[PDB]
Design a protein around this ligand. Structure first.
Ligand SMILES: Cc1cc2c3c(c1C)C(C)(C)CC=[N+]3c1c([nH]c(=O)[nH]c1=O)N2C[C@H](O)[C@H](O)[C@H](O)COP(=O)(O)O
Ligand SMILES: Cc1cc2c3c(c1C)C(C)(C)CC=[N+]3c1c([nH]c(=O)[nH]c1=O)N2C[C@H](O)[C@H](O)[C@H](O)COP(=O)(O)O
Ligand SMILES: Cc1cc2c3c(c1C)C(C)(C)CC=[N+]3c1c([nH]c(=O)[nH]c1=O)N2C[C@H](O)[C@H](O)[C@H](O)COP(=O)(O)O
Ligand SMILES: Cc1cc2c3c(c1C)C(C)(C)CC=[N+]3c1c([nH]c(=O)[nH]c1=O)N2C[C@H](O)[C@H](O)[C@H](O)COP(=O)(O)O
Ligand SMILES: Cc1cc2c3c(c1C)C(C)(C)CC=[N+]3c1c([nH]c(=O)[nH]c1=O)N2C[C@H](O)[C@H](O)[C@H](O)COP(=O)(O)O
Ligand SMILES: Cc1cc2c3c(c1C)C(C)(C)CC=[N+]3c1c([nH]c(=O)[nH]c1=O)N2C[C@H](O)[C@H](O)[C@H](O)COP(=O)(O)O
Ligand SMILES: Cc1cc2c3c(c1C)C(C)(C)CC=[N+]3c1c([nH]c(=O)[nH]c1=O)N2C[C@H](O)[C@H](O)[C@H](O)COP(=O)(O)O
Ligand SMILES: Cc1cc2c3c(c1C)C(C)(C)CC=[N+]3c1c([nH]c(=O)[nH]c1=O)N2C[C@H](O)[C@H](O)[C@H](O)COP(=O)(O)O
Lengths: 207, 207, 207, 207, 207, 207, 207, 207
């Protein structure tokens, strides 16, 4: 298997809940283990923008998402926002890649400054200290200089700043096809197989 | 009339030709004068991603776009890539706002370093020196640190870095509704009226 | 197989065409796929410094190099300087490592600033954004502070700055042995096997 | 086998000789090849803080450590402080990971500035230029700003700054259990198996 | 009496609760007044790593610690996390020295950025603005560049960054002797007498 | 007694041996304890510029200086350049102030970068980490930017950069009176009484 | 003739009037033309520290100094502090080297920031813009970080920061011999012959 | 005569002893005086890579090199690594240009930080403070960011960073012709005549 066995998927309070759910579903189909974290603001976004009725408490959430994705028994683990007993809270945990999708500008700030105010922020702090993959998927416009400084600092440290900025070069027909572009880019970054976005120019031999 | 009378609209070689055409059409409907500039790479993008058959030479382009948008006689001016006789090449020109949509990472670089290799890049250099509005609409993912440094430098100088990162909070039903989100944000930035994206919370009085 | 399956090999206009041709030949012998890019200035260098008569147009070049190296059918792909349909132009391409050998100071600048003026520069921009290997092989002396700043910026982002500065510690007898030192260092960087430069001290057990 | 085949283990003159000896012993048990380097000041520390009577000259040291650890024939190589014929002195050597444990503040300085005054410092300079793993294990308190600047510079370049700051969350009963915490973190960093420190939260499924 | 009359002792959520309790006990024995602050995460650490059953609410905590240490009547003051009426919340308070032991990376961040989210963070902000002693005792490994930048900024402003990195040069026999090394260094920093760690070389006259 | 009880006085290889000997003599007269360190290059300077025949080995040096200054029994301690058992090598030592007089540009460099190559450099590293007084007395001209950067870094951290730049405003009659100006400034910095340089304007009441 | 034909010699309000007068005298003996500028504070220093009774108004000063030095008719030109008609006020003047000896910390500041408050400061601003030699001779101790930053900035731009820090390695017998050391260094910097300070090691052939 | 009368030629421990010997020989043929300095590591390089049997002690070395080059009586002066009586140790020496060829990365570091650990490093420190020519000829690959930062700092101060990166544009036939390219560039930098590398384009009048 190419790519990581385990992904920590954190959803925070930016627009774009559909990207995080689609990623969750793709990861499950590629038989990966997912450690799923969601902020209170992200729960309000998912309520506002989607018709996914996600239960509030972690065990009910775990059961709902397991059904939603067709996941195996304990393939998706759900941890609450202060559960310091969860693997992402410590660098002594087994290695996983982390993706924050969508990543609010407030979460981006916390990760860039080291704030650790909750498990998502601590998980990212641990990813950086242990040199484990960290992918941030902001969805904001305009980006202010505050945002850009925080992204630059993190990029220079080896985090991947992957904005929710879909391309249009594979004839998208629906909102879902734009969602799938961004998700495909995340999986490419992680080294996980995907077949939603072809390899550019792969059959072009010369000219 | 709120907002600028004249906009220089530059399209460069990033994915997202639909955003630039939609903006062009909205500007025309708001009775603004548009000084339209398009790079060779952007012409290849518009060919690849859209079914708009845009003529190559500036007078034919001007006629095509005038028809496409329903514009008035000489409402859209089209200038080629080395036409230094055009108003955007000099700061002694009448003031206009400039938008580069989509803005390639190569154009972003040129604007951040001052390269002036063609009329688009020179136009942006002039906008910055004259303190006229400059909005850049990049479409790239991931953003590398090269990109982020260039965006930060320009943001700190007062350019608006407005990524093609649509929101999902107004129940988008189509690819067009995502395009219209980004276009609405550009027009809001410019102070030009738009009715594609409601004013958030405008009827919320308390709680 | 250790090391990458596919290498993008870009030759630009610094002295040292022999290094790029030797690398091309070694990569072919290690059964790798090569996406070969050459600038106009590099073509004038190869004419000035070598007796390799390299055809100008990409399909003739592809045939010439395939013969020169003994490569397999479509093992070497050749792309022209504005061929945006080629795999290196997009990060949605299959992953490859990129080497720019020789790397002119003008190309070094473009990569450090993000200029993207042609396919070589765009390919490097993509390597950096996707965190794929990027090795730059400058050949210049003196290095000015302009050069050194650009190299530092790129090194700090994880590019490998590998000057064409051969060592003399393996009893070189010819110009070719100096060329092979530098090529061996490139292949070591990439993780590709080579037997031109022994492993230093490999049989020294103690003292 | 996960992790590197060969480790360069350098011991320098900070308190904490026990960490370096314990690491040496763990590496040997995981059947790795160790290129062992020790400074004169580190030899005085090991004399002051431990009851290990380590011979001064490299072949006697090699024999002593081989016995101490139960190592195989030439599993541990010992090189003196100016032995430029040893593999760590050149980047043309076979790849290994390097750990400096303990790392004195003087060694940290030398690595951050590039001083190369002896084989340890040169070995680290080579690790950085070749992008091979480099882990520094300082033991100092307070850290001054001199120290912190040097650590930051090296961390930003991809070295791992791993202070000898044991945790207490696995019920340590002895000085040895604290030593083993730090050693476990080094081996985790290197990707080498260890069973001294459990994976945090590995059996926690939800809450 | 040498050293400060009053210490604000803040315990935050890093491993190493034993260091903070030992310091508390030493300060009490040196007849100092202690303003004790503890975060919720630190309370969970003390529960996880020690057999100290510390009551949750501040008056019960005050009574427990007073008994635990043998302190005098109101020698230990305990303030909750939002008690802005407490002396540490204002610079108009009587001067005290502040120690944060252990100091989580999240607390380090807050102090370096000025976040003031609770009384501990505000107390540190006040120490810095009033130029009163501030000692931070982090316990983390590896230190990432995020951490190191925050430590450097604070060190450059005159805070003392004192990692929980015990030395081994006074023949430690137990976990307690390592704890006492770090505590002795804190008291030395503060100018408070201690007899757990001898003065190095104090009887060495020459050589 | 005002000022420190114990001074570490390090002499390094810049011109100006007379300043260090004069300071040594003044410190002895003010009944302070002196921990005296001298580099090999400083010994060659004292031979070149003075008629002081200073013995090479530390106990003979100690006896010579004790006689030269009229010091009490073990008032002057002399430590050699690698004597890590001496108090200045550790921050667990009793507090003293440190003066490096004269301070070579090489010593200034080592202190600014943290090099610790000998006891003098380590002593300074310890002074900085423990926030103990550190006064550097360079004697060089011109100062290059290398020198000035190193001085600035150290000044910003709270070291006192006190060049051997005597004033002429107290009617100096001899080389000795210029030496005494600089020595008086060092003692003023340390808070040690001196009567060689009057207090400027002390009897001026008004105008 | 080696070295410049014309020197602008500015004396400002630091201690060390003797250095400026000695330099003036040496320049006159080497048949150079001197454009002499003196601040009001420097006039008060020369009154306080020397027995030179220097007239206040520029023509009387010119006559006095001409006599004092044995200069030729109009060899010394004297300009007042706001005489913008004097050659040093403009870069269109004939080239000369400039020395500010002594250079007050206030003058150093003005030159580093560009303040131009009087002819001395403007003259230095002109030297820097025209890339003409500028030598600053500060006499201050300690140097604060304010001072050091200003010196560094100017050194990095190519000014020579030459502190009044005499050496003792040519057996000085008097205050005058220390003055002559510093003056010799200034003349060496300027490329003007001097015989007060021998060429170090000039007769040493080997060892 | 164009160029300097006297060159300090320092050889340090990088590969490329042939460049330093060739330069030495060219300087001697141009009747310059050479102050030759060689490090211990450079002596081991010259033994490893060449068949030059260079005696260890400075007078024997002086005699050997004088014969090797055909130099005049005392045309080559040889100084050992701590000979502070030699002209390069002081800025009061007669002016010479300095070249460090090859320049190890350790020597580059020392020169950039001001370390002065031996006569070579001190000589370079003096060249920089006196604004005398300093040319560094590194031979390393890859260059790490440590190296590049040190080169940049020195380049910005006016040192010439001239890598041992030969060009191929004058039809080199042998290893010697590559050596001569680099040597020709050094002599061009110094302003010393050479006829090994023609003046590019000197007979091209137009096109
Ligand atoms: C609830 C809420 C918060 C939005 C938000 C919306 C809602 C419903 C939308 C969907 C209506 C409109 C867009 N929003 C954005 C957003 N932050 C951001 O970076 N990008 C967003 O696109 N925010 C703000 C963000 O949630 C906050 O600043 C939270 O404090 C983030 O906290 P978190 O990082 O712990 O999730
Ligand atoms: C033609 C071409 C160029 C793409 C491109 C594509 C094509 C068709 C797509 C649509 C197939 C895939 C995505 N592309 C992107 C892109 N540059 C960029 O910043 N973002 C893009 O989304 N580029 C590269 C960009 O066009 C170049 O680097 C040009 O040199 C930009 O030149 P310009 O700034 O003058 O327009
Ligand atoms: C054609 C040409 C260009 C040389 C050159 C030569 C020629 C024949 C030589 C071989 C005669 C002499 C040395 N050259 C160097 C060089 N640039 C550089 O960094 N190092 C070189 O060694 N250049 C300049 C370089 O080619 C330019 O600045 C181009 O604009 C680079 O464009 P490119 O990056 O797209 O290839
Ligand atoms: C010998 C000696 C040197 C100690 C030392 C001790 C001794 C016995 C102890 C064990 C008694 C007390 C603590 N020490 C520390 C230390 N340097 C440091 O960063 N942390 C330490 O914990 N040092 C100083 C350090 O050894 C020096 O500054 C050397 O010059 C380092 O040289 P090295 O990097 O080549 O080993
Ligand atoms: C509860 C909890 C939190 C640990 C923790 C542990 C637990 C039990 C351990 C003991 C099991 C494992 C190690 N931990 C560390 C830690 N933070 C840190 O900098 N170093 C630590 O050593 N953390 C995380 C830290 O508590 C958080 O990031 C909190 O948000 C800090 O909040 P605070 O600054 O207000 O106390
Ligand atoms: C021996 C020697 C070294 C001089 C020196 C002299 C001699 C006799 C003099 C007295 C003849 C001329 C002036 N010297 C100066 C000097 N370094 C410096 O910063 N300022 C000086 O004034 N140096 C160089 C300095 O000694 C070195 O660079 C040593 O490596 C410093 O080593 P140290 O810091 O361990 O003492
Ligand atoms: C008059 C006066 C001013 C001294 C001074 C003295 C006097 C007599 C002395 C001789 C008694 C004591 C030392 N002084 C120094 C000094 N400034 C300085 O950088 N170094 C000095 O050595 N100053 C201060 C300096 O003169 C001021 O700050 C002026 O504003 C400088 O103005 P200027 O640059 O235009 O000359
Ligand atoms: C002896 C030795 C040292 C090599 C070396 C070799 C040997 C024989 C070779 C020839 C086998 C392989 C390449 N080497 C290089 C090298 N340093 C460097 O910057 N570039 C080199 O090309 N080094 C390391 C360098 O010598 C050290 O780091 C010394 O401490 C430098 O000390 P120095 O600056 O005083 O000469």
């Amino acid at each position: 298997m190419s790519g990581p066995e385990r992904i920590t998927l954190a959803m925070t309070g930016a627009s774009g809940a559909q990207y995080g759910l689609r990623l969750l579903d793709c990861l499950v189909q590629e038989e990966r283990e997912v450690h799923f974290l969601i902020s209170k603001a992200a729960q309000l976004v998912m309520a506002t923008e989607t018709d996914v009725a996600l239960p509030a408490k972690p065990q009910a959430m775990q059961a709902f998402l397991t059904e939603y994705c067709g996941a195996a028994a304990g393939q998706i683990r759900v941890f609450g926002q202060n559960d310091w007993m969860a693997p992402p809270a410590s660098g002594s945990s087994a290695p996983n890649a982390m993706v924050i999708c969508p990543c609010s500008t407030g979460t981006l700030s916390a990760v860039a400054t080291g704030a650790c105010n909750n498990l998502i922020e601590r998980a990212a702090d641990v990813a950086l200290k242990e040199r484990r993959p960290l992918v941030l998927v902001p969805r904001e416009a305009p980006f202010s200089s505050i945002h850009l400084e925080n992204m630059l600092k993190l990029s220079n440290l080896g985090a991947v700043i992957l904005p929710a900025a879909p391309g249009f070069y594979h004839q998208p027909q629906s909102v879902e096809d734009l969602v799938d572009f961004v998700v495909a880019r995340i999986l490419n970054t992680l080294g996980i197989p995907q077949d939603m976005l072809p390899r550019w120019g792969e059959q072009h031999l010369v000219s």
